[PDB]
Amino acid sequence: GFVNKQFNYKDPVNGVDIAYIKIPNGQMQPVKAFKIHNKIWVIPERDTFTNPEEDLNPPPEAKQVPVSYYDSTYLSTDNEKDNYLKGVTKLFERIYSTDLGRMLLTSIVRGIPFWGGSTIDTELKVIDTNCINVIQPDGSYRSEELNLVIIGPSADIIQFECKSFGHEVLNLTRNGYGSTQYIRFSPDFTFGFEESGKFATDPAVTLAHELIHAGHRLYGIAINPNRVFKVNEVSFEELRTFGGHDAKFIDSLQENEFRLYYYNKFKDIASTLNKAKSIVGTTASLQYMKNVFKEKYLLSEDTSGKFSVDKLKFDKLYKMLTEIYTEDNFVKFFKVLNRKTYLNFDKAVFKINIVPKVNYTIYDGFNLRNTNLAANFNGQNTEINNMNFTKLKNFT
Ligand SMILES: [Zn+2]
């Protein structure tokens, strides 16, 4: 029970797990959000807030390959939002039902972005863009730290991504610090791939993929989006995240270099904590925050309270986040069918509804046990289980 409540969109606010909230950065209207687990919120809204140079209508020419889909009306009624909310929720339980997913979700919750927001080296301070403003029933607002936000897509409904706010000169997703992660995602759409057969990607696999990215970013160990490999042009970060054949397009030499790099980033954090003499805010004590970051980076502490990075513990956590959490391994754990390589050429978009248990369950996805859909991945077969996959026009 990763989500300990069956949330309904229409449910009254309480200021704790159902509340109207504001996102950092412009004078925006508050939106209804749901805290489905500690550190993890879902905002059933199209993401028009954080990125002002993006309108929800099709552009003059849609170029996202193999597929793109536009519908400015999607996610604009209470009923859609409820279905959105229940879909995302079901996907978290599905992910969490696996050992791999239990592990990744635990890491994500532990992955509190570092309090590196002060101008003074000896002072710990929360970065404000790693928070949200949560309205209480008393009408007042409280600033709250969070790690993950699942938000609805922007103009291109099937363009799913992991985004976060920057902070001055600091590279939060790449300096060991981390930052709150916003995942644009819809459980109401999926995309096709071919195999030997017309199949649909399981949306748990797609969400897990974004959570892996999120995991990298929360631990500030993401690889620069500029490091890319020519595939017959794809980022190291994506290849690493997909795993399988593709994750070995990366030479162990570069793999080794990154390990040491991010080891020293963790070291720099450990020393910062050791040299900390003050903290900003009324909420948490400096020792409390020390303990929080000790838990996140798995730091060792001596009898003096001084921190150090244990190699064994770093190597294991690092390997987990970069080599064990991969789309490929989620596929193995779910026992579903998925495209074999990162690059996809199947040009199919589908409208799905995973909320009713007759369509999709936590344990089997579309490939329901004690049904015909449990044979040969038939539930994902867009021809066999055609009632579950509404073929939509591709905008590309
Ligand atoms: Zn990705």
Swiss-Prot record:
It comes from the Bacteria. Zn(2+) binds at residues 209, 213, 238. It is found in: Secreted; Host cytoplasm, Host cytosol. Coiled coil: none annotated. The active site is at residue 210. Has protease activity. Has proteolytic activity. In vitro the whole toxin is reduced to release LC. After translocation into the eukaryotic host cytosol, LC hydrolyzes the 197-Gln-|-Arg-198 bond in SNAP25, blocking neurotransmitter release. This is Botulinum neurotoxin A light chain. The gene is botA. The chain holds residues 3 to 420 of 1296 of the full protein.
